[PDB]
Write an enzyme that holds these catalytic residues in place. Structure first.
Site, PDB file in Angstrom:
ATOM      1  N   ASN A 172      -3.969  -7.247   0.424  1.00  0.00           N
ATOM      2  CA  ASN A 172      -3.247  -6.054   0.775  1.00  0.00           C
ATOM      3  C   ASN A 172      -1.772  -6.185   0.599  1.00  0.00           C
ATOM      4  O   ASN A 172      -1.248  -7.201   0.225  1.00  0.00           O
ATOM      5  CB  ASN A 172      -3.591  -5.653   2.201  1.00  0.00           C
ATOM      6  CG  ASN A 172      -2.786  -6.349   3.195  1.00  0.00           C
ATOM      7  OD1 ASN A 172      -2.715  -7.542   3.171  1.00  0.00           O
ATOM      8  ND2 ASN A 172      -2.180  -5.616   4.099  1.00  0.00           N
ATOM      9  N   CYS A 211       0.413  -6.441   2.553  1.00  0.00           N
ATOM     10  CA  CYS A 211       1.064  -7.365   3.509  1.00  0.00           C
ATOM     11  C   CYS A 211       0.349  -8.725   3.518  1.00  0.00           C
ATOM     12  O   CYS A 211       0.561  -9.547   4.360  1.00  0.00           O
ATOM     13  CB  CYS A 211       1.196  -6.727   4.907  1.00  0.00           C
ATOM     14  SG  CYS A 211       2.439  -5.367   5.025  1.00  0.00           S
ATOM     15  N   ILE A 216       6.541  -1.134  16.020  1.00  0.00           N
ATOM     16  CA  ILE A 216       5.793  -1.094  17.266  1.00  0.00           C
ATOM     17  C   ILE A 216       6.205  -2.318  18.047  1.00  0.00           C
ATOM     18  O   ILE A 216       6.318  -2.278  19.255  1.00  0.00           O
ATOM     19  CB  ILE A 216       4.280  -1.209  17.135  1.00  0.00           C
ATOM     20  CG1 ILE A 216       3.912  -2.452  16.344  1.00  0.00           C
ATOM     21  CG2 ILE A 216       3.671   0.046  16.627  1.00  0.00           C
ATOM     22  CD1 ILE A 216       2.450  -2.957  16.582  1.00  0.00           C
ATOM     23  N   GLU A 222      -2.301  -9.911   4.453  1.00  0.00           N
ATOM     24  CA  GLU A 222      -3.104 -10.370   5.584  1.00  0.00           C
ATOM     25  C   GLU A 222      -4.630 -10.031   5.480  1.00  0.00           C
ATOM     26  O   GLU A 222      -5.478 -10.793   5.995  1.00  0.00           O
ATOM     27  CB  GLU A 222      -2.499  -9.839   6.885  1.00  0.00           C
ATOM     28  CG  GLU A 222      -3.219  -8.634   7.448  1.00  0.00           C
ATOM     29  CD  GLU A 222      -2.483  -7.323   7.249  1.00  0.00           C
ATOM     30  OE1 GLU A 222      -1.558  -7.256   6.412  1.00  0.00           O
ATOM     31  OE2 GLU A 222      -2.816  -6.323   7.939  1.00  0.00           O
TER      32      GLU A 222
END
Ligand SMILES: Nc1ccn([C@H]2C[C@H](O)[C@@H](COP(=O)(O)OP(=O)(O)OP(=O)(O)O)O2)c(=O)n1
Ligand SMILES: Nc1ccn([C@H]2C[C@H](O)[C@@H](COP(=O)(O)OP(=O)(O)OP(=O)(O)O)O2)c(=O)n1
Ligand SMILES: [Mg+2]
Ligand SMILES: [Mg+2]
Lengths: 681, 681
Positions: free
Chosen positions: B368, B370, B574, B372
């Site tokens: 992906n 990112c 977040i 991960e």
């Protein structure tokens, strides 16, 4: 003892102390070509029957086509074919056909077809089993009377082969789905060598909203940008750029950013639609108002691309629920020519002329990559997964052309036209473009074809009439008059034979007969003695009121098969094979030079031309626009689709010059304009 | 009397003669924020019940969600919610949530949610009617123990809203159809803000044939080029670039042209897959052989992207039916770092480590955006009209994270993990991505989720353990050990409750138990007194052999619901809301500065940090790679997918430095590497 056909060719490029040319030297080139290169590298079989066998066995000919005929019949045809007495008239014609059209062995090293083999296989393919038809097509092609489009000529019958049709027109709708699909069509069509044009006018303009949050849309360019990469990615085997086009309505808020890509989008071509009012505004030095397609939709439930701007300009200017932007009409046309001057484009489609001439229910909002096709189309609706929930109707082109001279040289003009129509129709019937459902649908619903013309300048010269002249105009008007009569007679017939007609017929002007009111008046008498003479000498009857009146009854009653019949595109290299002049305009040159071949160039003299009639071959530049525009108008009177029209100008010409021409054109009925060519070396 | 919260914020950016900071000044900022800006612009209703009413009436809340509950129950929940005693710990946390997360009125002028409202609606949404569940989620989120992914946190419950999941991984197959589809997915996914990565390894290389005619393919770049324009065209409302990625196998013939785009493709990110042999070759200064995917397919009936290169390197080198090209392995990694050095990318996926650790039938060939996510996938087959004839399986990400500190601070760790798993699972169940069938399929077949962690550095500091240390490593190993036990216990449960398991379970390692052999040996004793102490103090039991042995039986017998459980991505903003550190690495800074806001920047101090423990907050740069890499490995031992891992380096570092790190990583079990960050201002 001298067998350099190129050298021999080269000699056409020589003038003697009296400004004359050794035309024969070109014939010598043909002779050496066949002798030093063709004959030696072309394959001879003990019989035709074994040849077929082998060609099917080794994977070159498609047996499925041969299988619709009793093999004896086949053989009879190849024999007739080869017995017709066909010769190429020029070294380029030959050389073109063997370097790019005839079938070679898979390793390139040897030829397996000759002109008539190819002719035959084409005939067999389109005739789909009909033998008399097959024979006729053969005859028409060998005589020069007919010349199918390249894509058909080249692939019919082959086992490993292209598609038979290859220019396409597609809509896009104002939502991502459509956009995604467009890019995918671009890919699928262009991988296979198709030319494809896209309508962009429905797309919401730069700055419009998305999901009811303001200033969010980015208009057409980034979409232009994708299509561009697509075409560039998906070349056709043996090519580096692919070919695309985008059309956009002049009254669309992104018009100037659009034109601006060409002052950046390097390979798509542009085309602009222009309604009459735009001309009205600029005359009266006024402002042009651009309406938002976003709004237009919500307030009218139709897309920009489907409303009549001219007819609702004021209305729209007054509807405050429709956002308006303004630019100066006069400057518009200015930018238009400046671009045109720099780069040929954009093409121009006179929307109101077109829709007014359109015999078919619906409107016409876009055109093809050569600006000759004009037909209605319709939206497709998709599912979130791209699946079509409603398959609309898009457009594809089935083309072929007659060589006016040869047509005129044979009294059975009705046979001649019927055949071509029969053949193009076949092309349509056999066509099933699966990668783009809306194209398949369209074809299937309309059986539209586009029969076109070429060699006018060729003809007139031969008959000693000067291009542009009243003799010339008079002829082109009646020639097209008579061709129209027979083609519609033919499509009418087909509906009868097949017992169906195109979708929508009923809503058409053919249905109500209004399509004929034109022909039931009078023009149709030869304005001229010479012209009257030619038809007479040719043994051809100019259709008569009784004839039209009768055909009108038969049509109202029985219908026609094809929704659209004629279309006159430029005739690229087939013209060289056919030995005709680019379409109906004049001759970019006396001895055209092409930058092709192992010598760097190849030379091509015009048909019927000799040192004793050069003065009838004045080039397009020399003739200039008016005469050209005037010829096309005579033609535009009858051709139901449109005609590609280039204006050739001297390198001293100015944008105003260009603009005066476009106005004239416009004022004259011309449905559309193709590129503008500044003379360069 | 001082109510500039920004000013107050700014003050964290001040050091006194003793290198200490006014942390309190930040609390003052919160106070002024609520007082000068929030309270005043937030809407108060006479009761909750009318509020719901209004919010549904005016188009903000989705009534369909409220409708799965008896309205009294609802109200009870909002009340509990607001009764929990939640405060933000930092001025950025608050400011972030109100500027970008809480629901505002449609005109922007007023707030309609507060942290707990949002919490509530999230809880209601995921619990789909299950009240105890709803309560727990509420509790878990308010306590800080759990923090769903942004896309979920932000949209749950809203009427006008995004999708709940938003990073996706797609294959492409070596034919146009797949390509077309990829570009269309790019468009559809990215218009809605999704991040999407594409595998490119299956595509035939630059120079390969097409239709059995040589030297004709143009490889990946022109495809990279399209995806790029797509992403750039389809931003997300309120954004200018979209986000894409492409992965490519290092042994693919286009590898260097590929890397070369970044020395030109300006916005996609790159990622490179690298098998072990590549490391072997470069060690022994050898040549790297690149195999053609074209051939590979024909000779093996599978795509480059689906064979095991390491395992068939020699075989392949020997198969003469497979074309090979060679480049110097050592130079490869050199180019790799040079690029990385200039631009962060490419990411790197240690293919063999991954597949070896993969408990699931199939191979893993991409990742992906990112780096991960790691999961199997499978080809989709299309129809000429793009219609799926075979819908394969592609990947999408369902993410949320626990904040280790808060987790540890509550003895019922099993409840805590069960809930998150229950919630992410919900996210999966509610997910139905229609625009890309293969994604929908995948989700549906696998219910894969990715539970992740954050605030490690936060935790360790607070407990006075230094990042990197043996104390630290020891803790991270067991923490993850214990989290794994409960999550699989949970997924096992779900299969039972729901009476089904993921597709393929049977072929999995869970099915045969081999998935546990690891846990049935021994590591699992605290290597350390302090660590033993923490768990004890926390009241948490470290899973015991009897426990594993038992869970292994229950799994073999009952199965698990989700095919994949954990995944550890970076926790973007977040994290600021949750008051945790980017994931499990350390703290890019003590007082992180963001270039956000009307003052230009905003400052964010790390959790638990005070002038009396600064020495426990040494930044990532300062800690350097080894310690970081070492922490991730402890974690990599258990996490079934993977973890985003950045290495932060000093601006004096060299590519060799970079390369030594990647080797260490590699040697250490690390499944993948994210970007490399050179320190800059
Ligand atoms: N992220 C996006 C979404 C849409 N568009 C463009 C492409 C289309 O011309 C136009 C409409 O797209 P859709 O109809 O798919 O948009 P919606 O239907 O969601 O929004 P609306 O209903 O606002 O038209 O907006 C875009 O550029 N970027
Ligand atoms: N005009 C084309 C046609 C194909 N391709 C590329 C894209 C694909 O990676 C690869 C295969 O495309 P297809 O499988 O559609 O090609 P075919 O199946 O027709 O040819 P083949 O059977 O040779 O693979 O070639 C291309 O760049 N340009
Ligand atoms: Mg819309
Ligand atoms: Mg293929």
């Amino acid at each position: 003892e001298t067998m350099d056909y190129h050298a021999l060719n080269a000699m056409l490029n020589l003038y003697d102390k009296a400004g004359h040319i050794q035309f024969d030297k070109d014939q010598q080139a043909i002779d050496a070509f066949f002798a030093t290169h063709v004959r030696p590298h072309s394959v001879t079989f003990a019989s035709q029957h074994e040849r077929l066998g082998t060609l099917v066995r080794e994977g070159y000919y498609d047996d499925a086509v041969l299988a619709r005929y009793d093999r004896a019949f086949v053989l009879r045809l190849f024999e007739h074919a080869h017995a017709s007495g066909f010769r190429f008239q020029t070294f380029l014609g030959a050389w073109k056909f063997y370097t790019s059209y005839t079938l070679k062995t898979f390793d390139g090293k040897r030829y397996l077809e000759h002109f008539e083999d190819r002719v035959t296989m084409v005939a067999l393919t389109l005739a789909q089993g009909d033998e008399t038809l097959a024979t006729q097509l053969t005859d028409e092609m060998l005589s020069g009377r007919f010349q199918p489009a390249t894509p058909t000529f080249l692939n019919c019958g082959k086992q490993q082969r292209g598609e038979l049709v290859s220019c396409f027109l597609l809509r896009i709708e104002d939502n991502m789905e459509s956009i995604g699909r467009a890019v995918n069509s671009a890919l699928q069509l262009s991988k296979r060598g198709g030319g494809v044009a896209f309508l962009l006018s429905n797309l919401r303009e730069a700055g419009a909203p998305i999901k009811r949050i303001e200033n969010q849309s980015s208009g057409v360019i980034p979409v232009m940008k994708m299509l561009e990469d697509a075409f560039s990615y998906a070349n056709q085997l043996g090519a580096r750029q692919g070919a695309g086009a985008v059309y956009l309505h002049a009254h669309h808020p992104d018009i100037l950013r659009f034109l601006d890509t060409k002052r950046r989008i390097k390979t798509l071509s542009l085309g602009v639609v222009i309604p009459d009012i735009t001309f009205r505004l600029a005359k009266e030095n006024a402002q042009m108002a651009l309406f938002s397609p976003y709004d237009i939709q919500r307030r009218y439930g139709k897309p920009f691309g489907d409303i009549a701007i001219s007819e609702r300009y004021d209305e729209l200017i007054a509807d405050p629920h429709v956002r308006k932007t303004y630019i100066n009409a006069r400057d518009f046309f200015q930018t238009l020519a400046e671009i045109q001057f720099e780069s040929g484009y954009p093409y121009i489609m006179f929307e109101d002329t077109v829709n007014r001439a359109n015999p078919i229910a619906g409107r016409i909002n876009m055109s093809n990559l050569c600006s000759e096709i004009l037909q209605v189309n319709s939206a497709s609706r998709y599912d979130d997964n791209l699946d079509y929930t409603h398959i609309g109707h898009d457009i594809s082109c089935n083309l072929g052309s007659l060589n006016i001279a040869h047509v005129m040289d044979s009294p059975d003009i009705g046979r001649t036209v019927e055949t071509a129509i029969r053949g193009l129709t076949a092309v349509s019937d056999m066509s099933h473009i699966r990668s783009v459902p809306s194209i398949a649908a369209g074809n299937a619903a309309s059986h539209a074809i586009g029969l076109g013309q070429m060699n006018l300048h060729g003809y007139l010269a031969r008959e000693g009439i000067a291009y542009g002249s009243p003799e010339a105009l008079d002829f082109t008007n009646l020639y097209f008059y008579t061709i129209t009569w027979h083609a519609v007679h033919t499509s009418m017939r087909l509906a009868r034979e097949r017992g169906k007609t195109f979708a929508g017929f009923a809503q058409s002007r053919y249905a109500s007969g209004d399509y004929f009111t034109q022909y039931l008046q009078d023009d149709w008498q030869p304005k001229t003695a010479k012209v009257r003479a030619l038809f007479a000498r040719s043994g051809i009857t100019l259709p008569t009121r009784e004839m039209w009146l009768k055909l009108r009854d038969d049509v109202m009653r029985y219908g026609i098969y094809n929704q659209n019949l004629q279309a006159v595109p430029p005739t690229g290299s087939i013209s060289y094979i056919n030995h005709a002049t680019s379409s109906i305009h004049p001759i970019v040159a006396k001895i055209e030079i092409r930058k092709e071949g192992k010598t760097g160039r190849v030379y091509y003299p015009a048909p019927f031309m000799t040192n004793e009639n050069l003065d009838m071959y004045q080039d397009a530049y020399d003739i200039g626009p008016e005469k050209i525009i005037d010829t096309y108008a005579e033609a535009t009177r009858h051709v139901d689709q449109g005609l590609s029209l280039t204006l050739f100008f001297p390198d001293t010409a100015t944008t105003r010059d260009i603009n005066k021409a476009q106005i004239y054109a416009w004022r004259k009925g011309i449905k559309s304009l193709y590129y503008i060519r500044l003379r360069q070396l």
